[PDB]
Ligand binder design. Structure first.
Ligand SMILES: [Mg+2]
Ligand SMILES: [Mg+2]
Ligand SMILES: [Mg+2]
Ligand SMILES: [Mg+2]
Ligand SMILES: [Mg+2]
Ligand SMILES: [Mg+2]
Lengths: 72, 175, 58, 51, 109, 40
RNA sequence: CCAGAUCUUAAAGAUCAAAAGGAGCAGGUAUCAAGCACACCUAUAACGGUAGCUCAUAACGCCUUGCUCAACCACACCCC
């Protein structure tokens, strides 16, 4: 009966958790790896604007904070 | 803040005959002094509906309900001050602040002058519901902040580059 | 009449009516109150209609 | 000619309305009497109890 | 006799959406459109800016727009003609009396 | 569902077919690598 | 809605019709959700003044594509 659907899920979940334990630190890399792409693409997004709006420098008092890498 | 004075003689006893001759003990018993809080809220209700309204009798009047609701809100706010952890009553307050806004939108569509005067009296302000409810998140708030400042700059630069042209062409026209 | 804007407002005015805005700036006002649905239709047809002959011609 | 005919219709109907509304006013006064009587009675009762 | 506008908009009525500009009203128009699958009529909306001398339009007003003969800007092709219902103050076209909703404020007699 | 829903979602479109192994062409010219055998 | 080109002709007709527009209709995808000055006001006569505009009725993207066919749109070695 419908348990037979749940069994599949139950297994697929278990078999996933196990995986994410072994793979943990590999995972941890690739997460942060993409956060450093994010923050960069983000930056370029704004850089694009100065250069598109004709300004040479980034406007006064702009440090362009890091949102994605926010921790603690 | 208003203050329904300690001696105010609970509402249901206000208009009955032969009160003031009565001795100070019983007066003390029927005072707001010995009252529940519900009583004080009946009073606040009365006073507010006298100051604000036209026809004290109409309950169904859109105005009336706005005033009454406002009284109860003001109460939920004090109860909110003293209990900050109480989620239930936070819910009531925030539903109610809203419903009041609903009926205010009704006044503003239907009878304008009246709506106006109520907003004046009860210190309620009507802020039109802004289109597009979107959760502003860090990425967006930041990119907008930047853009706003880029604008604020390019209009400055345009201003100066045209200002030196004003100065140059005027200094050539003068001599 | 696919080119004629038809708008509808609810409960603004305590008595029901039609309005009509013509090319001239002529404002027609048709009071429909205890009228039958059919009566409104035929009344409108009367006021700004087209003669049957007009249509047939076209 | 048409517009004037329309005008006429509006006039006549307007009148019918006026008559109706007058009727409703008489009805409203009768009601107001009934209301005032019941309100007065309960005012009596409440006053009694309080005193 | 030539004064024209190439735009089909020639006369419309819409709500007044926003006041945010000087002497220019943001007015939303709504026409019925027949959805061909369902064969039903739905409200399609379109916004028009309009020009105002008095800057007289509150938000929420039912307003009559007249096409302008020569367009002011890309986005302004209209002039507010008459206010059909000023919001919150509405005087019944029939009887010429002040009203709110179903109720007259000052009745006949 | 309801009519407003059927309006907002439009009528259903019949999804374009996913091209198979031949990538849409009737046949393909090909060059042999290794002849071999498979089990059913 | 028509500038212009051409044709006819005793100056006004006619055929194409650029640009510019907008009632409405118009490929997939929302895992593309915000775009980033995209508005207006002054008729002063190119300067000033406001702080706006678009967008969940799908803006801004990305992907695929001639077409609604007495025809229409587009290209003409590539760098629109
Ligand atoms: Mg499995
Ligand atoms: Mg990743
Ligand atoms: Mg209590
Ligand atoms: Mg053309
Ligand atoms: Mg995906
Ligand atoms: Mg400027």
């Amino acid at each position: 009966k419908n348990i037979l659907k749940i069994r599949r899920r139950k297994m697929n979940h278990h078999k996933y958790r196990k995986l994410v334990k072994r793979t943990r630190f590999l995972r941890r890399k690739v997460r942060e790896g993409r956060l450093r792409q994010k923050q960069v693409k983000f930056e370029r997004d704004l850089k694009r604007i100065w250069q598109k709006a004709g300004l040479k420098e980034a406007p006064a008092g702009w440090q362009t904070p890091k949102i994605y890498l926010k921790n603690q | 803040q208003d203050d329904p004075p300690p001696s105010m003689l609970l509402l249901d006893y206000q208009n009955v005959p032969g009160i003031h001759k009565v001795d100070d003990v019983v007066k003390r018993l029927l005072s707001l002094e010995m009252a529940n809080q519900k009583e004080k809220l009946k009073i606040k209700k009365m006073q507010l509906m006298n100051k604000v309204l036209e026809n004290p009798e109409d309950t169904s009047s859109l105005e009336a309900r706005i005033v009454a609701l406002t009284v109860k809100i003001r109460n939920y706010e004090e109860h909110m001050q003293k209990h900050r952890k109480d989620k239930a009553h936070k819910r009531f307050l925030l539903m109610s602040i809203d419903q009041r806004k609903k009926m205010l939108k009704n006044l503003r569509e239907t009878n304008y002058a009246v709506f106006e005067k109520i907003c004046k009296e009860l210190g309620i302000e009507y802020t039109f519901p802004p289109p597009y409810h979107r959760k502003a998140h860090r990425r967006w708030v930041t990119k907008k902040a930047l853009c706003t400042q880029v604008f604020r700059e390019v209009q400055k630069l345009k201003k100066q580059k045209r200002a030196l042209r004003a100065a140059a062409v005027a200094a050539h026209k003068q001599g | 009449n696919p080119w004629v804007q038809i708008t509808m407002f609810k409960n603004m005015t305590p008595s029901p009516f039609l309005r009509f805005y013509l090319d001239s700036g002529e404002q027609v006002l048709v009071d429909v109150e205890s009228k039958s649905n059919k009566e409104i239709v035929e009344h409108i047809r009367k006021i700004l209609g087209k003669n049957e002959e007009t249509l047939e011609k076209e | 000619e048409l517009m004037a005919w329309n005008q006429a219709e509006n006039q006549r109907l307007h009148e019918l309305r006026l008559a109706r509304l007058r009727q409703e006013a008489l009805e409203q006064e009768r009601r107001q009497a009934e209301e005032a009587v019941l309100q007065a009675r309960e005012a009596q009762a409440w006053a009694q109890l309080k005193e | 006799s030539i004064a024209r506008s190439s735009v089909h908009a020639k006369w419309v009525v819409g709500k007044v959406i926003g006041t945010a500009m000087q002497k220019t009203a943001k007015v939303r128009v709504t026409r019925l459109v027949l959805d061909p699958y369902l064969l039903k009529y739905f409200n399609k909306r379109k916004t028009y800016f309009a020009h105002d001398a008095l800057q007289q339009c509150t938000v929420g007003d039912i307003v009559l727009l007249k096409a302008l003969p020569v367009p002011r800007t890309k986005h302004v092709k209209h002039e507010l003609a008459e206010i059909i219902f000023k919001v919150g103050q509405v005087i019944d076209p029939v009887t010429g009396k002040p009203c709110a909703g179903t109720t007259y404020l000052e009745s006949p007699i | 569902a309801t009519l407003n829903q059927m309006h907002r979602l439009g009528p259903p479109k019949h999804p374009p077919g996913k091209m198979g192994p031949t990538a849409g062409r009737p046949q393909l010219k090909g060059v042999v690598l290794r002849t071999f055998i498979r089990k059913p």
